[PDB]
Amino acid sequence: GPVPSRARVYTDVNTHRPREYWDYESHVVEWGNQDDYQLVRKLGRGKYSEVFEAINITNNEKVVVKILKPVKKKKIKREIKILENLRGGPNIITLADIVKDPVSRTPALVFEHVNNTDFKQLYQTLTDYDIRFYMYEILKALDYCHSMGIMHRDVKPHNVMIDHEHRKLRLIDWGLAEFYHPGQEYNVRVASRYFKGPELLVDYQMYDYSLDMWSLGCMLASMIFRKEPFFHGHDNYDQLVRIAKVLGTEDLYDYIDKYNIELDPRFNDILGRHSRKRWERFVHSENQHLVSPEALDFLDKLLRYDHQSRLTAREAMEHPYFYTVVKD
Numbered sequence: 001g002p003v004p005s006r007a008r009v010y011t012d013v014n015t016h017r018p019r020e021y022w023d024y025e026s027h028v029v030e031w032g033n034q035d036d037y038q039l040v041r042k043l044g045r046g047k048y049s050e051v052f053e054a055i056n057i058t059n060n061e062k063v064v065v066k067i068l069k070p071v072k073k074k075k076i077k078r079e080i081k082i083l084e085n086l087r088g089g090p091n092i093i094t095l096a097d098i099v100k101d102p103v104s105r106t107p108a109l110v111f112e113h114v115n116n117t118d119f120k121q122l123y124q125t126l127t128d129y130d131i132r133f134y135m136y137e138i139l140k141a142l143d144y145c146h147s148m149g150i151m152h153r154d155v156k157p158h159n160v161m162i163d164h165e166h167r168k169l170r171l172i173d174w175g176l177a178e179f180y181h182p183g184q185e186y187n188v189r190v191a192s193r194y195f196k197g198p199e200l201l202v203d204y205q206m207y208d209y210s211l212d213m214w215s216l217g218c219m220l221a222s223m224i225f226r227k228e229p230f231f232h233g234h235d236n237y238d239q240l241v242r243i244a245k246v247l248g249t250e251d252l253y254d255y256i257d258k259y260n261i262e263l264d265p266r267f268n269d270i271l272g273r274h275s276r277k278r279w280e281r282f283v284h285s286e287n288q289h290l291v292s293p294e295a296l297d298f299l300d301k302l303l304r305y306d307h308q309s310r311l312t313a314r315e316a317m318e319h320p321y322f323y324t325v326v327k328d
């Protein structure tokens with residue numbers, strides 16, 4: 001069978017919490033007043049919800065209303081409990097309220113509103129310093145939720161709301177997030193394809209917080225190199241082949257050999273043999289201004305096959321890449 005794995009940090013956080021903290025199936029939702037919130041315009045539709053900009057008429061302030069499509073009560077309470085546990089943490093989106101939507105017949109989460117700059121203007125104009133700044137702001141959020149027993153499992157540009165005017169960042173969409181318990185086997189069908197960690201792509205279920213750091217590396221590579229997404233697979237199989245053309249196939253085999261994992265035989269025809277590449281290969285005159293030796297070394301230490309060898313969020317915040325960022 002496969003070799004078990006545990007997180008190298010925050011391993012026992014949920015163990016020594018009261019069972020109330022992580023036993024989300026037992027959570028009792030405390031409902032607000034649906035009539036306090038007036039929908040203004042639809043902002044998005046996902047597979048699991050729709051999201052609206054709205055007004056809270058008791059303070060005339062804008063809020064964002066996420067009305068869940070029908071989903072199992074378990075998963076609704078999971079998201080709710082996680083939002084409540086993490087509320088007030090650095091750069092975590094704030095759950096303001098929860099109300100019963102009369103039309104949907106499902107819960108509606110009420111969030112703080114972020115005046116977000118949308119993501120193509122952000123991708124096109126963020127400077128070297130801005131990338132470092134916002135990376136640091138993201139690591140603050142990730143170190144907080146990891147220290148609180150929670151992995152996000154869906155880190156990607158669209159879940160990072162930035163109001164670039166006020167240099168304000170918020171990590172959103174906790175609907176895939178889970179509590180980390182040592183030895184617990186999880187569902188590998190999480191994260192968007194381009195940000196899925198190798199552990200997911202080789203069907204290794206006993207993963208942990210370090211999955212978020214792989215996804216964060218994919219975001220970082222897309223920004224400093226100006227290739228979004230960076231690993232652009234046509235499906236989950238070709239996703240792993242795209243990674244292996246950069247990180248090499250020899251270390252991929254070392255990885256699965258360490259955990260006594262076996263690749264799906266369907267890779268036999270498509271994986272090939274690939275050397276590991278130096279990151280300088282992706283540097284050119286149109287992304288040069290975003291690359292430094294520090295950037296490449298930091299990236300290199302995030303994008304590791306072995307989830308156990310990636311930097312933790314806290315370790316990443318110690319990296320020289322962030323020495324130039326003004327600390328508050």
Ligand SMILES: COc1ccc(/C=C2\S/C(=N\c3ccccc3)NC2=O)cc1O
Nearest residue numbers: 044045046051064111112113114172173
């Ligand atoms: C414009 O400002 C905001 C925008 C979004 C959120 C929070 C969200 S959005 C979400 N899920 C989605 C996303 C896209 C489509 C459908 C559902 N989950 C969250 O927590 C908070 C904001 O202040």
